[PDB]
Amino acid sequence: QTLEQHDAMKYSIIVAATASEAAPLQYLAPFTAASIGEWFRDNGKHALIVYDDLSKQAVAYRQLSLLLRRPPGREAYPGDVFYLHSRLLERAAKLSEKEGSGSLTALPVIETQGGDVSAYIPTNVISITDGQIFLEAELFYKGIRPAINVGLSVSRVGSAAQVKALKQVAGSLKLFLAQYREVAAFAQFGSDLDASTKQTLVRGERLTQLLKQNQYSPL
Amino acid sequence: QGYAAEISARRNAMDNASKNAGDMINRYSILYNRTRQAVITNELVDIITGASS
Amino acid sequence: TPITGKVTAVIGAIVDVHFEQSELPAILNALEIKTPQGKLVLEVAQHLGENTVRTIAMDGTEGLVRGEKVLDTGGPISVPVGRETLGRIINVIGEPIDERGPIKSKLRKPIHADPPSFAEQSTSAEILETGIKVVDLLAPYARGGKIGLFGGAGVGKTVFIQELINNIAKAHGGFSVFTGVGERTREGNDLYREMKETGVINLEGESKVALVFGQMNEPPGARARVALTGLTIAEYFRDEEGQDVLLFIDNIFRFTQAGSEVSALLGRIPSAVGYQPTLATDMGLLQERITTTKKGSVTSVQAVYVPADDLTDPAPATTFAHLDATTVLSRGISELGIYPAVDPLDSKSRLLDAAVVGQEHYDVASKVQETLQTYKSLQDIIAILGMDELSEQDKLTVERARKIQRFLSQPFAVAEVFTGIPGKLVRLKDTVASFKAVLEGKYDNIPEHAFYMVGGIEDVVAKAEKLAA
Amino acid sequence: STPITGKVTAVIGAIVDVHFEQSELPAILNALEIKTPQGKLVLEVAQHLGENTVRTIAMDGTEGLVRGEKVLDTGGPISVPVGRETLGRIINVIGEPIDERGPIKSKLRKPIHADPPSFAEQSTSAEILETGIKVVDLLAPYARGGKIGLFGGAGVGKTVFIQELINNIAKAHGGFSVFTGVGERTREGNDLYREMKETGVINLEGESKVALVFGQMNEPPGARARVALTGLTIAEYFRDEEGQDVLLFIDNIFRFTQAGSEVSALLGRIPSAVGYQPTLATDMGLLQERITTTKKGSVTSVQAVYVPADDLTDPAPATTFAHLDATTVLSRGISELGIYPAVDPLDSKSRLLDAAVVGQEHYDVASKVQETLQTYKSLQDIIAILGMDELSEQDKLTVERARKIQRFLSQPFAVAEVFTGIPGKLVRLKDTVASFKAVLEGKYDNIPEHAFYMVGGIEDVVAKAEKLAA
C-alpha cells in the first residue's frame, strides 16, 4: 500500500512466501525471485532485489533437512547453507556490454540475533558480501530512525560505486566522524578536555545531527 | 584549607569508587560463570545432535 | 467406519494405532478410542505406514491397555458453536466445564482450519486506548492489532491482561474471546468469578465473552490443540458471525512448549534449544488464523511466558514476526519497582509513527526515549563514581529521567486488592499533556517520592502537597 | 567382470552414491565421470560402502539426476593440465579453460593429489624477500620460499593489500606465479583479471608470467575444496619438472577450510570443534607441506586468510596461525585510525626478524619500536580517566613518539585510486632501517605526527615534515 501510494508498484514486484506458506516453498522462494531478476537482467533491464529475511530461509531449509534427516551443520542449519546462499548471491552482478549491460543488484538482509554476527548464517553472508550495513537498536532509542552504527558498516567497493560529486564532498567526512567517535568515548571518562579535542567534539555534534534520518523521507 | 579538602576529597572519592567497582566485578563474574556453563551445554548439544542424526 | 485398529503402542500421549485395513485415516483426521475413560479423542499426525499411524492424543493418556480398539471419526473434530459458546468455559472436547451443560450447536466447525489468504486481508491502523499511560504513549493499540506481552515469570501477566479486559473489553463489542492455554486453575477461577460478577459473563443475559480454559495439568498433546479449538471459536465469530472480536491467549509459550515436547516422540528432530522444527510453521499458521480479515478484525493479545527470559530463544523470536505491536514486560523493570513492569525501551507499535497518532505525540515519545537511553547509558559511570562527576547538563537530564521513570508507574486497578493501593487509569489525551510538561521540567521541582507509585500528573502534584504536610 | 559402470542409487544433494556392478573393485580418491548433457559430472570417490557401492561427493549441480545412470571411473584423482599453456589462461576446477583461449596443457596432465615431499626434500631457505613496504619489511619481513600469511579480518583494505603485493612482489619476482582464487567473488575475479591484464602480467599475446585458476564462491563446496589441490599441482610442475621458481598466491584460504568442513559434515563424519572437520590439522598440513622448497625449485606461497569476526581462537584460524611462516595481522583498531596498511605490529610476526638475521641494527630498531607502542597502548587507560595526571614528561614523549610511529606505519598503496588515490611508496630496506632509527633517536621529534602519515623512506619523512612546515 505504501508502494502504491508512492506509485512505485508500477515497477515493484513482490515475491512472497509468507510464514504460513510452506518451508519447502520458503526455501524455493529466494531462488525463484532471483530468476525473475535474471530475466530483467537478461533483457538488459536493471533491477534490485531485497532479500528479507534470509535468516528465515535458513530456518526453513533446516526444517526440511531435519525432516529428511540429513546431517545438519552447526546451529542445526544444514552444512551446505553456504552453498545455497553463495550460488544465490553471485547471480547479482552488473554485466558486461556483451551481456546487455543488465544489472541485478542484490541487497541481502539478515536480522541480527542480538548482534550475534558470529552466528553461522550471519558470518557466511558477511564473507559473501561486498558491504556490511550494521544498524544499532540503541541508536534507535537514542532517537535516530533509521539508526545506523557506521563503525561496523563497510563498503569494500569504495567510491567507485559513489557519485563523483559526493566522493569529493564526503572525503573527510569519515575522518571527522572517526575523530568524533574517539573523542566522544574519551569524554565520558570525564577527563578534562583541551580545545583540540573540543573542536572535534563541537564539530562532531553538528555532524551527528546531520546524519540523522527520519522514516519515510527520500532526498 | 581549600587545598587540603581538595586532596582529601580525591582520596575519599577514589576509595568509594573502588568499592563500587568490586560490586560490579562480582555481578559480571556471575554472568561470566553462567555464560561458560551455557556454552558448554550448547557444545554438548551439538555433539549429541551430530550423533543422533 | 470399517477403519478400526488396535493400539500398538502408547509411548507418552503419542499413541500409535494399527488399523486392520488398508483404508486409513488422513493427517489431521480424528479417532475415538473407546476406553473406560470414555472416548479419548486423538488426531492422526503421521502415517508411519503399513497401516500404523502415529497419533497425537488430545485427550490424556494413562491406564491404556495395548491392543485397544480404535474407530476413525475423521477430519479435525468439530466442536459445537453458537452464541451459546458465550458464557461457557469449555474443555478441549468443547464441553462446558462451567457446567451449564452442552452448547447449542448452530455451526460445528473443525478444530484445524486453513489460515485466510493474502487476498482476504484488511488493513487497519486504528487508535485504541488502553487506559494505561506508558502503553498509550509508546504503543497505542488498533482495532485488529496484534499485541503481545513477553511477560517474565509471574510478572503480573494475569494482572496486566485483567486490566486490559477491564478497560478494553468493556470498550469493545462484536464479541471477545478469552482462551487460556495451560492456565493456572486458581487464577482462572478468580477470572471466572470476576467475570460473572462484572457481567462479562452474564448467564441471566448473554455473555459478551466466551471462554476456553485448558489447564496446565492437561497432558501436552491436549494443550497444543487447546489453541486450535480457540482459533475456531474466534473464526466463528470473526467470519460467520462477522464480528470484530478480541482474543486473549495466556500463554502462547505453552503452545510452543507443547510443540517442543511432542517433537521427539513424533520422530521429528527437535530444532535449536528443543523447539519443534515445525516451530516456525506452526507459529505462522496460528498467527495467520489470528490475522485480520475483511470479514472481521480481531485484536489479539498473547502472553508469552519467556522461559528464563532470553528473547532470542527461538519461540519469542518467531513471535516478534507476527505482532504489529509488542509490549515486552521484563523482570528488570519489575525489580525497579515500577508497576506496570513494561519495558519502556522495548515497546513498539507501527501505529506510534508520525502524525498517525500525532506528530506532537510522536515527538514527545521520541524525547522520552532519547532521555532514557542516555540515562541508562550513564548508569555504570554514575554508580562507580557519582552523578556529580558528570556534567550539570547531564545531571538535569538524569534528574528529569529518574522522575520520568518514577512517573511511569500507575497502580493496577485489578490488582488494586493485591497491591492494596487503589488503581489508576490514565487517558491518552491526559498522557500527551502530562509527559509534555515533564519534558519541559515544569514539575521537575517536586519530590521523586511524589512521582513514585502513583498515576496522573495531577496526582503527583497533589501528593507533593501531601508530602509537604 | 562388468564394464566400468556405476548406477546412481541415491542423490541426496552433493552426496551421490553409485553402485558399481558386481565384479569390479573401486579405489579411493578417484574421479568418476558421468556423461551428462550438463557436461560430464565429476564425482570424487570418497568412501566405499562395500558390495561395489561407493559414496561420492559431486563437484557440480545434481539436478536432473536419475537413479540408474551409467558411471565411468577414471580410477584416480582428477588429471589437470600442466604446461606453459597454463601460463596465461584461466582454468577451472576440472582443468578447463574458462578464459576460452582454447586448450590448456602442454603435452602433459598431472593428478590433483600429490603428497608432501620427504623430510630431506623439505628444507627451506632463510632469505629475506623485501617488498619495499616498511611495516612488512621491518616488523615481519617476508622470506624466500616462505609461507606468508596475510591474516586480516574482512576487507579492511584486504584486497588492496594483496593487490599491492602482486604489484610489488610479482614484478620483482624472478619466477612465475599462479594466482588461485578459492571461493572469491566474480567481481573480485573480474577485477583481478582486468588488473593483471593492466599490469601486463597477463599478456594476451604470448605467455603471461602468471597462470590463473578462478574458482568462485557460487560453486558447490566440493569444487571449492578440490580447487586447492589443482592449483597446487600446477605450481609443483613448475617447481619440479620445469624447475622454474614460483611464488604461489591463494585467496582466501579460510574458504578452503570452510569448504572442507561442509563436505566432512555431508559425508556424515561427526564434526569436531566449531563445526570444523575432524581431519582439519592433517588436511591443512597436506596443503602446506606440499608447498616447499625442494632441490628442484622454490615456491613462495602467499596465502590470504580471512579471520571470521576476528576469531583467532576458532580452530580453522588457530590451526593456520601455526601453519604459516610469515604472518601479518591487520587489526580493526589500526584500520579505523586511518592507518593503511592496518597491519598491527605487535600481532605481525615473521620467522625471520630476529638479531643479525635481518641485520642487528634492523632488529634493535624494531625492538625499540614495539616497546614504544606497547607502552602507549597501556597508557591509553591512564589517559582515559586521569588524562595528564600521573603522566610524567617521559610519558608524554612516549605518547608522542608512539603517535609519530603510529602514522609512520601508514604508507600509500599503488592500487589506491578510489581507495585513496595516492600511489604506493616502495622504500629501500636501508632507508626503512634508517628512518625508524631517526624517529627513536628523536632526530624527528620536532616533526609532527602527520608528517609520518602516508610517507615512505627517510626522504619522505622529512618531505612530508617540510610540507607541513611550509
mmCIF file of C-alpha atoms in Angstrom, chain D residues 328-331 342-349:
data_model
loop_
_atom_site.group_PDB
_atom_site.id
_atom_site.type_symbol
_atom_site.label_atom_id
_atom_site.label_comp_id
_atom_site.label_asym_id
_atom_site.label_seq_id
_atom_site.Cartn_x
_atom_site.Cartn_y
_atom_site.Cartn_z
ATOM 1 C CA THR D 328 50.915 -10.179 9.177
ATOM 2 C CA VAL D 329 47.760 -9.483 11.132
ATOM 3 C CA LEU D 330 45.637 -6.482 10.303
ATOM 4 C CA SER D 331 43.540 -5.294 13.245
ATOM 5 C CA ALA D 342 46.225 -1.668 9.034
ATOM 6 C CA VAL D 343 48.893 -4.246 9.971
ATOM 7 C CA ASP D 344 49.222 -4.295 13.760
ATOM 8 C CA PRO D 345 52.967 -4.540 14.595
ATOM 9 C CA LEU D 346 52.534 -6.471 17.812
ATOM 10 C CA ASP D 347 50.426 -9.033 16.001
ATOM 11 C CA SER D 348 52.620 -9.155 12.867
ATOM 12 C CA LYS D 349 55.408 -11.668 13.345
#
